[PDB]
Design a protein around this ligand. Structure first.
Ligand code: MFU
Ligand code: MFU
Ligand code: MFU
Ligand code: MFU
Ligand code: MFU
Ligand code: MFU
Ligand code: MFU
Lengths: 343, 343
């Protein structure tokens, strides 16, 4: 697997970016913008404690409360959650299980967080809240398959969760709810190709899933639903380049997709749709830096992309999107590790 | 009450704007962009039939299905829904009650649509889906108060619904859920002022409610939460102008608020936050035309504002936020009436 993202990031319900990563102590730490604008100062790193053995994944409940999922030292899924929106945190609590990947997390149309992770059998498993933004949690449940990457999940424009992963043949595979909120899932299906990164999935401005992944020649590839929330999918297409990390995809404030990834000189590169969403793609361009993780990208409250990546000093660095050139690479300090359960 | 909005507008799950209005036959008609882009052509007007006696209000269920609420000729609340996302429509069905205002509609954090309408006692009443995006519906319940305008609803950044309506003293009042999804609401709180239009409410880029209304001198006023999802509120602040309709507010793609209203010469006027969201407001500027309703504004899938208003020929007209100085007005044809239950 190509080098992973090292933080999970969200724009919170009060328009501040909040970033979560794993320290050299194997605890989860978070850092938050003090103001809801590009170029804001940062709180600085605060520990949520714990001892984790995967990438932490943050998700926002439908009531705005942040919730973090990660594998623990006992290999169970653990979580920790804000007890009120943007306020204080609970203690860490186990959700049991024994998992062998990073979690992937999404919310159902009924407000129930659904968490996906690989099992000891190498199947995809899932567990979910039984009520909107609320425990108790369900029991684990298998979705079978046998997968060789961390999973990625997104919602279709008809409300059906759909999960993506690399299979034993190194192809992109997927599986989907048969109906919104449903514990009844489809059978596994294959989209072919050969991929050398975790896949990353996004919903387009016109309601279609689009999936990006590094290919066997280390170029960036993508593939998409041809109609909203349905098949057929397209043929694989190449966006070229050569990337030395997992790709990260985000939607600009005007709908245009943009993808970020480490280049072969360890600098950050990006490529974007031009003209409009679903428009033709640009040439790759550099944003400089020397980075030691995959980048992570998010839209801030001013409608600008912000990217995060670990530096040569093992600190987290940040850069954001401005008219002619981007911002400075700015250090948020800290000392992060790649705790990804599959590397 | 100042002259109302004539259509209800929504972004569909496949990135097209869809507008809903009442025809000269008192049936609900709709028109949809053919393409998810600014300046797209339109399907043309299609009837949903029925016979309504309020402004119709569309809302998108969390599974992507559109649903329209309107008062019927029997003064009850009626609704009609898509049977599949962006597909065919149900028959009209009654939710009963007797209502004396336009409905206001919002979704709870648990995916259950809540509908609010003034009752025969001039209290605010509500009815909701009992499950996520699904019937059956609840019994009617009173949220008390005595109100003299149409209600407006939005969700807080902590997931609590909040409703605004003018009171018997002509002040802006409000009530809120004590917790997300709850049927337990607060008492009516006065935010004072004297308002001469329905209030409009929006959520800011940093998670605060902000309310706009015409005041006693026909100026535009606004008031806001000073902290995300909490009090205290600011004082009322004038945005000046002299407006001859209800105002409509929308958020740009970069978070800046922009308000639209009819001026004294019956043209469309607007005013916007400059620099960034929550920044200082512009001067009023005209967008020309001659309109016979309040405008309705929405962001399209390219991140551009689109405004709709009835024209002198009773057709619906459109203008959108093109680079230099906005598009030309284009007619979408049709023949619309103002069916608002309170005028
Ligand atoms: C809070 O508890 C600590 O962190 C959790 C995430 C688990 O790894 C547990 O075994 C460890 O003791
Ligand atoms: C269902 O098929 C099994 O699981 C898929 C996810 C792939 O790994 C495939 O090659 C494997 O045999
Ligand atoms: C712009 O700065 C460059 O890239 C950062 C991400 C850091 O690795 C730093 O040490 C390096 O000089
Ligand atoms: C389909 O039913 C028609 O429209 C409804 C919205 C009601 O006004 C009803 O009385 C009328 O007959
Ligand atoms: C269900 O209750 C009925 O409808 C409500 C909306 C109110 O108008 C009430 O006075 C009336 O009795
Ligand atoms: C709760 O109090 C009732 O409702 C408010 C909205 C006001 O109209 C007030 O005059 C009335 O007595
Ligand atoms: C731009 O055109 C002007 O405004 C439109 C909204 C229509 O009312 C039209 O008749 C009028 O002349």
């Amino acid at each position: 697997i190509a080098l992973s993202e090292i933080v999970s990031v969200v724009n919170t319900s009060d328009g501040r970016i909040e970033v979560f990563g794993v320290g050299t102590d194997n605890a989860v730490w978070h850092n938050r913008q003090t103001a809801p604008h590009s170029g804001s100062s940062w709180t600085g790193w605060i520990s949520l404690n714990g001892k984790v053995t995967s990438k932490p994944v943050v998700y926002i409940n439908t009531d705005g409360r942040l919730e973090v999922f990660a594998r623990g030292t006992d290999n169970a899924l653990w979580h920790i959650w804000q007890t009120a929106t943007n306020a204080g945190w609970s203690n860490w609590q186990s959700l049991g299980g024994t998992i062998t990947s990073n979690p992937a997390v999404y919310v159902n149309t009924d407000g129930r967080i659904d968490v996906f992770a690989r099992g000891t059998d190498n199947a995809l498993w899932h567990i979910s809240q039984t009520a909107a933004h609320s425990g108790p949690w369900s029991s684990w449940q298998s979705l079978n398959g046998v997968i060789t990457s961390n999973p990625a999940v997104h919602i279709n424009s008809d409300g059906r969760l759909e999960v993506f992963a690399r299979g034993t043949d190194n192809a992109l595979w997927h599986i989907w709810q048969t109906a919104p909120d449903s514990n009844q899932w489809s059978g596994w299906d294959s989209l072919g190709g050969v991929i050398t990164s975790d896949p990353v999935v996004i919903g387009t401005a016109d309601g279609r899933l689009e999936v990006f992944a590094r290919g066997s020649n280390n170029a960036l590839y993508h593939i998409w639903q041809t109609v909203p929330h349905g098949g057929p999918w397209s043929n694989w297409a190449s966006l070229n380049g050569v990337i030395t990390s997992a790709p990260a995809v985000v939607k600009n404030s005007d709908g245009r997709l943009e993808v970020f990834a480490r280049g072969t000189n360890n600098a950050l590169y990006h490529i974007w749709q031009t003209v409009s969403h679903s428009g033709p793609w640009s040439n790759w361009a550099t944003l400089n830096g020397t980075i030691t993780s995959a980048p992570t990208a998010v839209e801030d409250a001013d409608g600008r992309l912000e990217v995060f990546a670990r530096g040569t000093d093992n600190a987290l660095w940040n850069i954001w999107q401005a008219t002619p050139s981007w911002s400075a690479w700015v250090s948020l300090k800290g000392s992060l590790i790649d705790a990804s359960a599959i590397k």
